[PDB]
Every structure is written in structure tokens, then in C-alpha cells.
């Protein structure tokens, strides 16, 4: 049928966690080459795209491509049953009415069934060829900056010249984090490639959701274009989780 | 290999009718989760995208994905043979030469080779998003079509204005969003990020409104420089029309 | 599992040759209806899309979709063994550790290519309507690009008139051609459909890679839109497209 075993349930847990607080219901297409999924939020201001490759699984077998509609709050609830390092394996049939999530801890074990639903899959490819600027920084730093400036206001501005400035201007005060590219410990390097400069403003509400993809990666990529939704990538082991966020006009 | 049974042939008939007279000839990709098909027209000003989910069928089985190239007029003519309550079943074998349409009389349509270049031009967010009775929309378009061959649309705050201007004269229809709690299917819905001013070909709008035979309501998403999207939702599915505006 | 035979390895050879020195590596998705592949260059200025239909093969059987990650230089090297008249047959198994390229003649060599893991994030940037769509003999086009790329590293296009103009340090040059229909030889006719006029400047070095695709087709299609990447297509039951981002 279909069976996919995460060596540690922790991974799939963190993966769902990342876009859990973003969107509501989501379609999961499982193909021969692994699992892809996409969801757009309430206001259609934010899209989450997720690609999980075969080598992120301890084992992966999908004979017939299978889509799985899922309520994210439900799936998360089943995923808190958890116990982290334990082998989690999703199992679905040819035409499944439900997906089986099977936990095994090395001691012994539990099996759960999530009932799937029908969702219309209108899948978006809004990603561009070249974005005006492409930067990458430690996800932790980015997390900190967003969390700090989101104190001062609801709207955070990002400016790239070669200089990257983060600016919040509120009804209390303002704040500015200016950071510049360098190479060092490669995990801490701030990389920047700039074609034409960029000045873009985003809802902090959303950015705070985007940054909790920090649990999946050391580093975040950020690609920005003038008229386009900005793209925020957290790379997986053979995969990624990206957030497309439409700028404010 | 592939067998898909509509409860009533009337549905497939009305779908194909819906985007017939719009586009030329169309590639139908049948997968495990059902049928998607796309076609662009003569001047490439209009694209039809169709998704039919698995639960719009009385039953559906597709073992391996199969594409079916089809001449829309040929298929339509074969679909004229329908009793509109007869149970239509499409059938294809592993590498189809032809597709069998079975009414309950059996027909065969010989397939064509077409190039599969497929278009995702849909956008994340559109400036304005409205929805209204497909009937009302078809009326407005049909009326304004009389006065000129170019119909313009303006979304303001709570204002939606349709305006035609030509040699004969000038029409204007103005509707506002409202919630009718007696009958929710007639309620006019509108969401607006930025206002929009967009002109479209009446020739094309007239083709687009023919999809009103599939749905109570039509959604309309308008972005400022992007092709406007007109959606008629189905039972587990939809038929959408992407129409490029006028410069 | 997966078995695909080209009547002449010549074809697969010139296909890979076309985008070989353009892009870094490539992901080949083989499906029931045939092969598609996409690659972006390092500057992400140039995308190559490739569609090869079922009927570009002497025989084609793909039971279930299989993706094959490949190093282009490696593949090309294993394709240098081709006779250009030999029947090349690609073979891959359920989960593809390696692809088997099999050359055979009327008088047989079997090569194995180690497959890599590439993240496939595929782009659909193609538009509905392009401001201008023209088509000319690939021959002519390659000559024009080759000539103007002498005078400058930036070649400009202006569209019933099609003007190619390069202005560099040493000098400038202008080739102007107009749409015409030729009853004698339709393959040499230049066609133009213009909704809006277009003015676009491109990198010469990239256009020079793009014209390499001339070995695959009599004619090149060119679709130029104002803010968008221009689309250069060489047809094959299939095609090879080069999406090239204009310069600002």
C-alpha cells in the first residue's frame, strides 16, 4: 500500500509544528519520490510548501501515489502521543479513508488512526526564477530579530543594499537591526547576493509564525523580490519547508 | 486500467459544453485522485482549467496515470448521444489508442498526441475577491455585451461596478455586498485588499458565463496586472477560466 | 521497470548537448507519458525545461514514475561512446541507484551511471500571454547572435519590425528583419505576433548557449514579455525551452 517510517517521530512532529500555527487543513501528496504538501492561510497572505525526500525517512515505500487530506490540529494531537525518539510510521491504503500512525519505542506500542477528508487540491507554483536579493543567516539570529522588532510594531521592514537592515516603527518606539555579510564557523556566516536592492514590509504576526521553522534548521534562506511574495526556506535532510509571504503594499 | 463512471452523463456533457466554444482541443490527465485538464485558446488570452475529484463519480478507478488527447468537438458530438440520465463510463486501457464512452450503446473516440506544456499562472492573493449568483452574472454580462465589446469591472470598497461603453451607448450595473439570511445562495460576497479597475473582452466573458450551468455561484478573483480568475465550483472539483485583461 | 529506446543515440546526445554547458546538474522525471527535465543555471538567470514525449522513442515503457538525478558532464561523457547511429536504451529499476545506458548496433556496450540526490523544486514561470511571439529559422538566429555577440556582451531586442542591436565598446551593430511569408519554403519564413511592442536587453554569453539548441530544430520560437523572462523554444513530439531573464 503505502508505508513510511520516520526513524524518530520527533522529526514529523517538528515538521507539522512549524506550519501548524500557520494554516488549517492540508493536502499531503505522497509520491514515489516522497512527500510534498502545500497550504495557504486564512487571508491567502501566506503559503507553506513542504518537501520531504526519501532519505529523510528511515524507510519509505509508496507504490501508488496517494493524497491524504488532514486536519492539522487533529494530526498534531495524534503526534503529541509522541515519545520523540520512537519510530513513527505512516501507513495508508490504495484508496484510504484513514491514515495509520504507528509509534514504536525500543522498550516494547501504540497505533493511531486519523480519518482523512476531501480537500480540493489547487496547487500553486508562485516561486520565481531569480529574486532581487537572496540572503541566508542563522535561523536563531533571525528568530531573535523578528521576536525583538515585533515588540515595537506590527510591521517589520527589510532593506537590502551590501547591507541588510531590519526596521520596526511603532506607536511605542522604533528599532533597527543592521547586519552585514561575512564568512567565519560556517554555521554562523551571513551570506548575501544582491541583484537590485530591496525595500519590503511584512506583517509581524506572520513572521513570528515563519520563524518557528527554526526547529528544523540551523540556517534560514530568505529570497526577496520587489513585487513578489518573499520566500523563506528552512532546509531539511533531503528536503525543505518554505514560507511564501506576500509583502504589504 | 482506467474506468470512470458518472452517475449521469449530463454532468460530463455540461462540463465539456462549459469550456467547448472557448478552446481548441484539450489534454485530459487522469490520475489516482481524479481528472484534471487544461486548454488555452486561439490568441492565448484565455485558459480553462478543470479539476474533477474522485467523488464527482458514481465510481472511479485509475490504476496508472493516463493522458487523453481529445478533439473537443468530436467528444461533444459523441456526448450528444447521451440520455442525460444514462450512466456514462469512460474507459481506457494501459497505453490508450482510443477511449471508450459507455452509456446506460458504446462509443469509441480516437485519441490524439498533444504537447503537455502546462500552466500554473494562478496567484497567491488577488487584489479583490467577489462571488455572486452565476445567474445574475450571466445576466449582467449578457446585457452589457449589447452596448459594447469591452466590459469593464471596478471594485471600490463595498462597490462593484460593471460598465460597458460603445457607439450605441453606455451601460452600468452597480452591486453591493450583502448577506441575505433568508437565502444564502443569492448573497453577494466581496473581499478587497486594493481596489481594481479592469477591462475585458465581451466575446470571452460570454463564453465564460456558460459555466453557469455547472454552479449556483461564480467566484471572481481580480488582480491589477494579472489575468482575472472566474471559478464555478463542482461537487468535489471546479472549472476555472483565466482571462487576460485589456491594456 | 523503466526501459526507453532512442532509435538514434544521436538525438539524446544533441538534446543533452543543447543545455549541457548551460546548467549545473539535472533532475530527470520519467513518467508514463514520457520524460521531463528542468535545470536552472548558477546565477538563476537561465532555466532549461525539456519535454520528450512517448513518440520521440523507438519504444518507451515506464511502469511507475522514476526520477533520475544526474551530473550532466558525466552523462555527456557516457554519451560520447555513442555511434550517433546506435540504438540507445535507458534502463532504471524501482528505486534507481543507477541508470543503465545501453548502446547497440546492427553488428553492444552497456554503461552504468551513478545517480545523485537532487532536491526537486520545479518552477512553472511560463506565462499565458507574451507581449510578442515570433518565430524564425534557428540557423539565422544563431548567426545573428554570433555576429552581435562580437560587438557587445549585451544584445538587445526590439519588436511589424524585429530589431536585434548590440552596442559595445569597439562599435555597434544592427540586424533588422521583418515578418514575411514565403510560399516556396515555409521553413524559412519569419513570423511575428505583437500585442504590445517589446524592448529587452539580454546577456550575450547566455544567448550563445541558447542558440546551441539549433541542432535540434529548423526553427526557433521566441516569446518576449516586458517584465518576464523571455522564452526560447526549439521543438522536437516535445520541446526544449530556455527561459532567460532580461537585464534591468
From Swiss-Prot, chain B:
Sumoylated on Lys-157, and to a lesser extent on Lys-120 by the UBC9/SIZ1 complex during S-phase; which impairs ubiquitination and function in DNA repair. InterPro entries: DNA_clamp_sf, Pr_cel_nuc_antig, Pr_cel_nuc_antig_C, Pr_cel_nuc_antig_CS, Pr_cel_nuc_antig_N. It is found in: Nucleus. There is a cross-link at residue 157 (Glycyl lysine isopeptide (Lys-Gly) (interchain with G-Cter in ubiquitin)). GO terms for cellular component: chromosome, telomeric region; nucleus; PCNA complex; replication fork. The keyword Nuclease does not apply. GO terms for biological process: error-free translesion synthesis; establishment of mitotic sister chromatid cohesion; lagging strand elongation; leading strand elongation; maintenance of DNA trinucleotide repeats; meiotic mismatch repair; mismatch repair; mitotic cell cycle. Residues 61-80 bind DNA. SUPFAM superfamilies: DNA clamp (SSF55979). Keywords: DNA damage, DNA repair, DNA replication, DNA-binding, Isopeptide bond, Nucleus, Ubl conjugation. This protein is an auxiliary protein of DNA polymerase delta and is involved in the control of eukaryotic DNA replication by increasing the polymerase's processibility during elongation of the leading strand. Involved in DNA repair. Homotrimer. Interacts with RAD30. Interacts with MCM10. Interacts with UBP10. Belongs to the PCNA family. This is Proliferating cell nuclear antigen. It comes from Saccharomyces cerevisiae (strain ATCC 204508 / S288c) (Baker's yeast).
Amino acid at each position: 500500500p503505502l508505508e513510511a517510517k520516520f526513524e524518530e517521530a520527533s522529526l514529523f512532529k517538528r515538521i507539522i509544528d512549524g506550519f501548524k500555527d500557520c494554516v488549517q487543513l492540508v493536502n499531503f501528496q505522497c509520491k514515489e519520490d516522497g512527500i510534498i504538501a502545500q497550504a495557504v492561510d486564512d487571508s491567502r497572505v501566506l503559503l507553506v510548501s513542504l518537501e520531504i525526500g526519501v532519505e529523510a525517512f528511515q524507510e519509505y515505500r509508496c507504490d501508488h501515489p496517494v493524497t491524504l487530506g488532514m486536519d492539522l490540529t487533529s494530526l498534531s494531537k495524534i503526534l503529541r502521543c509522541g515519545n520523540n525518539t520512537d519510530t513513527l510510521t505512516l501507513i495508508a491504503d490504495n484508496t484510504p479513508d484513514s491514515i495509520i500512525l504507528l509509534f514504536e519505542d525500543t522498550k516494547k506500542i501504540a497505533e493511531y488512526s486519523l480519518k482523512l477528508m476531501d480537500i480540493d487540491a489547487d496547487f500553486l507554483k508562485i516561486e520565481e526564477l531569480q529574486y532581487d536579493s537572496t540572503l541566508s543567516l542563522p535561523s536563531s539570529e533571525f528568530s531573535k530579530i523578528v521576536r525583538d522588532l515585533s515588540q515595537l510594531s506590527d510591521s517589520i521592514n527589510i532593506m537590502i543594499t551590501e547591507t541588510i537592515k531590519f526596521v520596526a516603527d511603532g506607536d511605542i518606539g522604533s528599532g533597527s537591526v543592521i547586519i552585514k555579510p561575512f564568512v567565519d564557523h560556517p554555521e554562523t556566516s551571513i551570506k548575501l547576493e544582491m541583484d537590485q536592492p530591496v525595500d519590503l514590509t511584512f506583517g509581524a504576526k506572520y513572521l513570528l509564525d515563519i520563524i518557528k521553522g527554526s526547529s528544523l534548521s540551523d540556517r534560514v534562506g530568505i529570497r526577496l523580490s520587489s513585487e513578489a511574495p518573499a520566500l523563506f526556506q528552512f532546509d531539511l535532510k533531503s528536503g525543505f519547508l518554505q514560507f511564501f509571504l506576500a509583502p504589504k503594499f
